[PDB]
RNA sequence: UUAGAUACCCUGGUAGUCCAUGCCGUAAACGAUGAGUGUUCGCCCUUGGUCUACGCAGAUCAGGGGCUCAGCUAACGCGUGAA
RNA sequence: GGGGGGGGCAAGUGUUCUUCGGAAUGACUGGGCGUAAAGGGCACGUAGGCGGUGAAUCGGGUUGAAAGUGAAAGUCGCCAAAA
């Protein structure tokens, strides 16, 4: 059905290309008697062509991961302008974690206006044994720093809130982590992202010789 | 530990992340030659041809392109053989890897060779 | 110790001994066997590679050591050398993953024997190949009776018996070399081949043919060697070939037949029989049975030295001097029709 | 080899020093730098192969040019060849400009088509192939954004912010000969290829 | 990850669905070269120190200094006989190019 | 001059400025950037040395000054570092 | 503030005092000092720290092994009884 409607929209846009190419290539002569149709069918092309990039909003362009949210209230001062900013994080418990950030005019509207963009710009994290991370690592954003140490299988998640709700639905279960410096939100996000993407698992460390045993 | 050592190691690291592939270090040393070789046969470089055994000083090291932060210690400190199991936890990736390099009476080791031979000495460098 | 270079997904077990010209000993071949039996069941490694040293790729098989270790009379000291070269080359053939080999030096004797039964083979201008074991008293051994038996009409019976040079252009023309390159720009393809995180051969072949087969321009290599040979080496028995060549102590092309005459005369007579006991038999069998085929011959013509001289070649060629030693008490004139089966007995 | 003779005749390996890369220069001649023409040819091998393979799935290509010296050389292609659309070839004639390749599904509705063209076609080009100096930068940026591979001619003049996020660089270096037939190689390709 | 391997890891860990250029992208890797240092060597024709000083006088010597270096292994100051030969070739060539 | 004027505006005008020797010992004593050593993509300059010159510069040192690849920085920005 | 209703704890609850953590808020582990607090006006030089190479020797530091001691209680592992 997906391909059905895709090529169908393509049929629409192909009749668009046809007639509008014809009209364009008739530049020569009297003006109105082609421009009327010009405007009509181009407006039609708009209505149809934008529905492709419309689709991602609700049904597809929407997987079955889970999402979580952030939000604050920016300002402009032409009079006393007020708006809303909001953040979202998608994750599937296997580790595909992604996020997104966008603005709107009211809370639920901003939550929404990201609810269909969190599913783009995806980065894929490699959770070592389905419960924890491959090693210890420090990683810093501009002025937020981060420390990741694994734990053996039974402790549990020892992290904060903004970092817990990422290491949770990435698929980790026994990480201990320390974020230090700025206690901001959107830097801890993208700090976790600049961090987890930094771990080089033994698959990676086989960047040179040596099969790295696990100690059994 | 000296500072010409720190110098050799940092010149290595900075040439690496600059992207050149073959460098030359003027003030050479035996503890530095040993360390270049140690890195080599642990994998981190490609050739380490020292030139003048005496009286002049020149090494030409040609490099692979691995991570290599490898800070070279300055303030001496002991290392027994049974203390590495906890001391090499203060490298960058505390758990996984990096080879704290130790000096012994039986030649300059790394921490694997050390904890095998059950010999000690003094720390000199790191690996990441 | 053999030089294991472990790049990302391209391990390469480069045996070497630049004092022994990159010759081969039982330890070296056995260690390579260990490496390959380990690598076969490995998800990490993708393919395997074969290199040498700065001078040459492969030269000799320590048969000097084998005479010095057979003048005493221990069966196993030689039977094991040969068993673990044979089963080695069988493995070489039977491996689950691609096998690249490089050639620049004087690959000789068993030189190509390790390499060719793999996937790909890169040559160089100064690659120079021959198989003078008939000139030690021995035979082209361990699958040479495969990768030469399969060849243009009566051309393997040129190569093995006489033992002429096989250089780069020659091997890319005659398909002995799968690809060709230049010396100073070989690591150029080495890193290209190493960094690839790819599995199926169908794409490594393309990535290497990038810098693989790009010159076939020969105008004097085998231009008419083919039909020069189709007159003589298309006969039945070595002595008939050479008698027709004595008839071809000719007038026009003689500057060709004279030198091949001498090149053959530099070889033992019964061994000049075993080379045809090799090819004109293995031109239709596979490699593990052409392997055991030469295996019985190798174990026999060393212990059961009854008419050839397996040790005088060793004693002269290297030890004394490359003067033709007296490997020919019964020259080809009187070589029993059953001398070759007196070698080839344990066919059972 | 003989092809290297031909490249060397093609006034190509030599171009003034405005460089960030040196993996390429055979030397210099004080008014030129000589790149490694064998590397030139090897780059051509790889990229042309890539396009002739992408063929085997028939994915849209959408060349890009803005310096109309090649205009004729290129226009012999992209119409009845490759993309096959002469009408789109007219977009390419007068394109690269506006909201591009990432907000491709823009309205753009307002024409008032007085001595304007205003094409605005829309479909994901699964690979890009360009050749000009710098005005086209939007295509490179947006391709790198949306993970679209690119083939591009790079002279010594290329900032790192392009030279490193464009795959498949053809360091051809157009120079004293200016624009000469090159694209006829990719003309060979994709035609008498798709079987 | 790099533009070529990022995408592979992505699709393998099943982030997004496959692009239509992947099988060909891997089949035609990018043309990498050995990582070399700075120092673009100044490369020179062996016959530099005289063409500069001779085109001063009067292309063809820009390569005929080779046909002079060939005997240059025992050349004392054969610059004079070289410029003489150049006089000869120019004399005859311009006789011809005025007869045309 | 102003509501008023210790002021700014005008005209006078000593101490002070200057020299000799002494005393203080402070300034936004401000590249608001301690001192030193090694490694770093270039271009533009430029003060004074050096080598090489054959139409003309090319090279090499010490400095002083912009502009930049990268690197860093909360932000500006520096990059003879604030790498 | 009063009436009702509900949460958290529970023979205990709540306030204050008291000390640590959070507090990287004295940063050895675990900072800074251009514009935010913080580079001295500048140097000299005393201790003091730290600081080239290769060859030799000694064995103080260093380091390998043994015994003595490092009270018992305590922390901790196990074990068992005890509720």
């Amino acid at each position: 059905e997906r391909d059905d409607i895709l090529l169908e929209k393509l049929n629409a846009i192909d009749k668009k290309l046809e007639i509008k190419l014809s009209e364009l290539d008739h530049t020569f002569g009297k003006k109105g008697k082609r421009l009327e149709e010009e405007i009509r069918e181009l407006a039609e092309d708009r209505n149809a062509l934008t529905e492709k990039k419309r689709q991602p909003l609700y049904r597809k362009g929407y997987d079955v991961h889970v999402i979580d949210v952030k939000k604050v209230c920016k300002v402009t001062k032409g009079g006393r302008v007020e708006r809303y900013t909001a953040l979202m994080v998608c994750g599937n418990y296997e580790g595909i974690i992604g996020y997104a950030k966008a603005k709107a005019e009211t809370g639920q509207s901003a939550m929404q206006k990201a609810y269909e963009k969190c599913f783009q710009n995806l980065h894929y994290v490699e959770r070592h044994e389905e419960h924890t991370i491959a090693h210890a690592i420090q990683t810093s954003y501009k002025k937020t720093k981060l420390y990741l140490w694994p734990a053996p299988t039974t402790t549990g998640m020892k992290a904060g809130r903004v970092v817990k709700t990422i290491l949770l639905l990435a698929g980790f279960k026994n990480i201990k982590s320390k974020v230090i410096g700025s206690r901001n939100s959107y830097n801890t996000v993208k700090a976790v992202l600049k961090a987890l993407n930094a771990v080089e698992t033994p698959k990676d460390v086989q960047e040179k010789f040596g099969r790295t045993v696990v100690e059994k | 530990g000296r500072r010409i050592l720190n110098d050799a190691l940092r010149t290595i690291v900075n040439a690496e992340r600059r992207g050149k592939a073959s460098v030359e270090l003027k003030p050479i040393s035996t503890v530095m030659s040993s360390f270049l070789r140690i890195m080599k046969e642990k994998g981190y470089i490609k050739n380490f041809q020292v030139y003048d055994p005496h009286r002049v000083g020149r090494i030409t090291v040609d490099l692979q392109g691995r991570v290599n932060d490898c800070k070279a210690l300055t303030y001496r400190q002991d290392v027994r053989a049974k203390e590495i199991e906890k001391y090499t936890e203060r490298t960058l990736p505390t758990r996984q890897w990096g080879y704290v390099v130790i000096t012994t009476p039986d030649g300059i080791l790394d921490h694997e060779e050390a904890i095998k031979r059950n010999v000690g000495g003094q720390v000199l460098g790191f690996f990441y | 110790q053999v030089l294991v270079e472990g790049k990302a997904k391209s391990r390469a077990a480069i045996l070497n001994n630049p004092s022994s010209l990159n010759a081969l000993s039982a330890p070296m071949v056995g260690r390579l066997k260990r490496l390959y039996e380990s690598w076969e069941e490995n998800p990490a490694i993708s393919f395997v590679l074969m290199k040498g040293s700065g001078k040459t790729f492969c030269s000799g098989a320590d048969v000097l050591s084998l005479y010095h270790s057979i003048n005493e009379g221990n069966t196993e000291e030689s039977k094991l050398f040969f068993e673990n070269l044979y089963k080695f080359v069988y493995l070489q053939g039977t491996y689950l993953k691609p096998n690249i080999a490089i050639m620049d030096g004087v690959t000789m004797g068993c030189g190509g024997g390790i390499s060719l039964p793999g996937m790909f083979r890169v040559a160089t201008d100064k690659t120079v190949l021959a198989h003078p074991e008939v000139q030690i008293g021995f035979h082209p051994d361990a699958g040479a009776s495969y990768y030469l038996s399969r060849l243009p009409g009566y051309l393997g019976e040129y190569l093995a018996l006489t033992g002429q040079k096989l250089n780069g252009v020659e091997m890319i023309a005659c398909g002995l070399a799968t690809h060709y390159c230049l010396n100073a720009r070989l690591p150029l393809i080495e890193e290209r081949i190493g960094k690839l995180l790819t599995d199926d051969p169908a794409v490594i072949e393309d990535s290497l043919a990038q810098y693989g087969d790009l010159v076939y321009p020969d105008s004097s290599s085998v231009l008419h060697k083919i039909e020069l040979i189709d007159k003589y080496f298309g006969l039945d028995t070595v002595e008939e070939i050479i008698e027709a060549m004595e008839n071809e102590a000719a007038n026009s092309c003689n500057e060709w037949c004279k030198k091949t005459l001498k090149q053959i005369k530099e070889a033992s007579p019964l061994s000049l029989k075993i080379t045809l006991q090799s090819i004109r038999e293995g031109r239709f069998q596979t490699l593990d049975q052409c392997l055991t085929h030469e295996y019985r011959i190798s174990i026999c013509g060393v212990s059961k030295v009854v008419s050839g001289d397996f040790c005088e070649g060793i004693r002269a060629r290297l030890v004394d001097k490359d003067f033709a030693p007296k490997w020919d008490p019964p020259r080809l004139e009187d070589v029993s029709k059953d001398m070759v089966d007196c070698y080839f007995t344990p066919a059972s | 080899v003989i092809q290297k003779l031909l490249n060397t005749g093609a006034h190509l390996g030599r171009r003034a020093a405005e460089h960030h890369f040196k993996q390429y220069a055979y030397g210099t001649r004080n008014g030129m730098t000589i790149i490694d023409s064998d590397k030139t040819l090897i780059c051509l091998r790889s990229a042309a192969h890539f396009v002739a393979n992408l063929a085997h799935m028939r994915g849209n290509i959408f060349f890009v040019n803005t310096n109309p010296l090649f205009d004729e050389i290129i226009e012999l292609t992209s119409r009845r060849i490759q993309g096959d659309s002469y009408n789109h070839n007219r977009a390419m004639n007068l394109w690269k400009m506006g909201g591009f390749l990432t907000n491709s599904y823009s309205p753009k509705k307002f024409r008032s088509r007085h001595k304007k063209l205003c094409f605005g076609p829309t479909t994901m080009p699964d690979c890009v192939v360009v050749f000009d100096s710098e005005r086209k930068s939007s295509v490179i940026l947006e391709a790198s954004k949306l993970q679209i591979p690119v083939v591009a001619i790079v002279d010594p003049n290329v900032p790192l912010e392009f030279f490193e996020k464009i795959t498949y660089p053809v360091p051809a270096r157009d120079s004293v000969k200016f624009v000469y037939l090159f694209c006829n190689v990719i003309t060979k390709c994709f035609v008498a290829e798709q079987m | 990850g790099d533009l070529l391997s990022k995408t592979r890891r992505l699709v393998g860990g099943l982030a997004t669905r496959e692009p239509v250029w992947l099988k060909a992208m891997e089949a035609s890797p990018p043309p990498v070269f050995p990582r070399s240092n700075g120092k673009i060597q100044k490369i020179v024709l062996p016959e530099d120190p005289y063409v500069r000083k001779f085109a001063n006088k009067h292309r063809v010597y820009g390569c005929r200094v080779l046909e002079l270096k060939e005997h240059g292994i025992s050349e004392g100051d054969a610059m004079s006989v070289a410029n003489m030969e150049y006089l000869s070739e120019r004399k005859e060539m311009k006789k011809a190019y005025k007869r045309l």
Side-chain angles (χ1 to χ4, degrees), chain C residues 130-196:
Chain C
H131 311 272
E133 307 94 344
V134 68
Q135 301 174 12
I136 321 173
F138 209 56
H139 41 76
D141 44 354
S145 74
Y146 197 103
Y147 69 86
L148 314 172
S149 87
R150 272 63 170 175
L151 198 65
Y154 294 111
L155 195 60
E157 288 104 2
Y158 173 90
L159 306 187
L161 289 66
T162 82
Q164 185 53 44
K165 293 179 179 179
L166 274 304
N167 290 23
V169 289
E170 199 151 1
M171 296 173 314
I172 47 180
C174 320
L176 196 151
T178 72
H179 310 282
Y180 180 78
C181 81
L182 301 85
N183 170 41
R185 305 153 183 186
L186 172 67
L188 180 59
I189 201 155
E190 214 180 57
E191 56 167 9
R192 286 176 93 203
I193 213 74
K195 52 193 58 185
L196 269 196

Side-chain angles (χ1 to χ4, degrees), chain D residues 41-188:
Chain D
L41 207 172
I42 287 172
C43 306
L44 270 192
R45 281 178 202 163
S46 175
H49 175 233
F50 176 45
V51 168
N53 307 128
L54 178 64
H56 263 285
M57 306 148 75
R58 283 99 162 108
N60 36 7
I61 297 100
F62 183 64
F63 286 56
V64 179
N65 173 9
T66 44
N67 188 6
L69 304 184
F70 310 82
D71 209 320
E72 305 96 9
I73 285 175
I74 178 173
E75 82 193 47
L76 173 61
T77 73
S78 85
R79 72 204 332 164
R80 293 182 183 174
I81 305 189
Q82 299 146 189
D84 184 1
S85 187
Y86 87 90
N87 284 308
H88 291 329
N89 168 300
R90 297 324 305 242
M92 297 172 190
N93 278 38
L94 272 304
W95 192 223
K96 168 270 157 182
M97 316 319 191
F100 204 83
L101 258 289
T102 66
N103 206 22
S104 67
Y105 306 86
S106 167
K108 211 170 304 280
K109 55 177 280 163
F110 154 62
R111 304 291 185 197
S112 54
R113 272 175 184 187
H114 163 273
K115 198 176 175 179
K116 289 292 186 166
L117 275 67
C118 298
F119 289 98
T122 169
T123 297
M124 295 296 173
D126 308 1
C127 275
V128 180
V129 177
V130 317
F131 29 82
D132 195 331
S133 187
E134 282 289 347
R135 185 56 159 180
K136 58 193 183 301
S137 293
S138 65
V139 313
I140 301 102
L141 169 59
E142 299 161 351
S144 62
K145 301 300 282 287
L146 209 47
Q147 295 92 16
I148 306 314
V150 54
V151 157
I153 190 179
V154 301
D155 290 359
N157 189 7
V158 55
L160 169 139
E161 191 74 32
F162 302 179
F163 180 42
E164 309 295 344
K165 71 192 50 48
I166 77 180
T167 80
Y168 298 120
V170 54
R173 323 312 168 85
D174 289 345
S175 65
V176 155
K177 204 170 192 307
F178 310 123
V179 316
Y180 72 126
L181 302 174
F182 153 66
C183 272
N184 308 65
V185 190
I186 299 291
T187 314
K188 273 193 212 161

Side-chain angles (χ1 to χ4, degrees), chain B residues 14-54:
Chain B
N14 281 3
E16 291 278 5
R17 80 185 60 260
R18 194 45 181 188
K20 309 168 207 297
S22 283
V23 204
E24 54 206 275
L25 318 178
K26 199 63 167 275
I28 69 174
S29 299
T30 173
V31 192
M32 172 214 294
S33 160
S34 157
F35 206 95
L36 297 180
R37 191 187 48 264
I38 280 183
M39 303 181 79
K40 187 78 64 192
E41 280 82 2
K42 298 297 188 171
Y44 282 26
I45 44 174
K46 183 193 103 195
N47 183 286
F48 80 114
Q49 38 202 347
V50 182
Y51 277 33
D52 214 309
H54 307 304

Side-chain angles (χ1 to χ4, degrees), chain C residues 26 39 82 88 150-151 153 192 218 229 252 286 289 322 335:
Chain C
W39 294 4
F82 288 119
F88 178 80
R150 272 63 170 175
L151 198 65
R192 286 176 93 203
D218 305 345
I229 282 153
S252 173
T286 180
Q289 278 86 22
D322 196 336
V335 285

Side-chain angles (χ1 to χ4, degrees), chain B residues 61-113:
Chain B
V61 52
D62 312 332
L63 51 88
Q64 161 177 0
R66 309 204 66 199
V67 53
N68 301 95
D69 82 331
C70 75
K71 284 200 194 191
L73 263 282
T74 65
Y75 71 111
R76 70 204 291 239
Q77 86 166 0
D78 49 25
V79 56
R80 186 174 291 176
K82 72 166 299 301
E83 87 191 65
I84 283 178
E85 54 85 17
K86 48 166 180 167
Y87 165 57
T88 180
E89 179 152 350
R90 270 85 174 101
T91 65
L92 300 84
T94 69
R95 272 139 186 82
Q96 58 188 358
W97 49 64
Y99 316 97
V100 180
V101 160
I102 169 184
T103 178
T104 71
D106 298 6
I108 308 193
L109 302 184
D110 307 354
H111 72 294
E112 51 274 54
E113 328 172 6

Side-chain angles (χ1 to χ4, degrees), chain E residues 31 41-42 62 64 73 76 79 91:
Chain E
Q41 179 83 287
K42 168 68 187 83
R64 173 146 174 70
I73 310 297
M79 186 192 207
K91 274 162 186 177

Side-chain angles (χ1 to χ4, degrees), chain A residues 1-10:
Chain A
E1 290 75 2
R2 325 192 174 133
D3 67 335
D4 291 18
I5 190 62
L6 185 54
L7 183 44
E8 199 75 9
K9 294 191 175 177
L10 291 183

